[PDB]
Amino acid sequence: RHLPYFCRGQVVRGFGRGSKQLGIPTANFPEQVVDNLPADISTGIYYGWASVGSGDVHKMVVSIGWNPYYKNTKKSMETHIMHTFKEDFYGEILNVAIVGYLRPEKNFDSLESLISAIQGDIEEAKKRLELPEYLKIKEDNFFQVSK
Ligand SMILES: Nc1ncnc2c1ncn2[C@@H]1O[C@H](COP(=O)(O)OP(=O)(O)O)[C@@H](O)[C@H]1O
Numbered sequence: 718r719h720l721p722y723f724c725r726g727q728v729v730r731g732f733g734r735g736s737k738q739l740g741i742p743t744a745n746f747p748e749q750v751v752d753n754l755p756a757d758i759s760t761g762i763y764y765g766w767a768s769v770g771s772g773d774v775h776k777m778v779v780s781i782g783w784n785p786y787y788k789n790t791k792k793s794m795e796t797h798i799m800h801t802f803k804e805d806f807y808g809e810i811l812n813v814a815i816v817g818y819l820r821p822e823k824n825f826d827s828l829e830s831l832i833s834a835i836q837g838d839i840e841e842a843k844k845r846l847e848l849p850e851y852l853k854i855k856e857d858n859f860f861q862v863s864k
């Protein structure tokens with residue numbers, strides 16, 4: 718309904734143990750960004766395009782979830798980019814275009830099932846983003862402003 722959704726924000730650290738531990742780093746935005754998401758934004762896994770600062774546009778998956786820790790029902794958002802970066806990019810601006818929904822949130826009974834699920838989400842996202850209707854979003858002026 719509110720896709721494609723375009724947003725930008727400073728990349729900020731999270732809490733607990735980072736998903737770098739799984740080889741699947743997930744970048745966070747400040748609360749301000751997540752708070753401006755429409756409500757028709759469901760929790761779950763989405764896919765789209767991302768660039769960092771003035772960099773090239775790459776495929777990405779975004780997880781939108783509920784935040785346990787803030788008062789009121791606040792959400793969380795974290796983006797894994799399907800690109801190998803040589804350096805972290807904290808403080809840089811992440812530009813995202815969320816283009817499609819993959820699945821609702823699910824409960825997993827082990828890290829093995831979780832990690833397999835995440836990997837499968839990434840492979841599915843890669844395939845779907847080849848569809849001409851989504852492939853074109855890579856070229857949106859949204860991403861050209863940041864270069
Ligand atoms: N492919 C990538 N996708 C997302 N973040 C990446 C990627 N490569 C490097 N990073 C870096 O990894 C950080 C996220 O790591 P992570 O372990 O999830 O910690 P945290 O969530 O606390 O920031 C990002 O802020 C960014 O600096």
Ligand SMILES: [Mg+2]
Binds near residue numbers: 731736737742744745
């Ligand atoms: Mg993370």
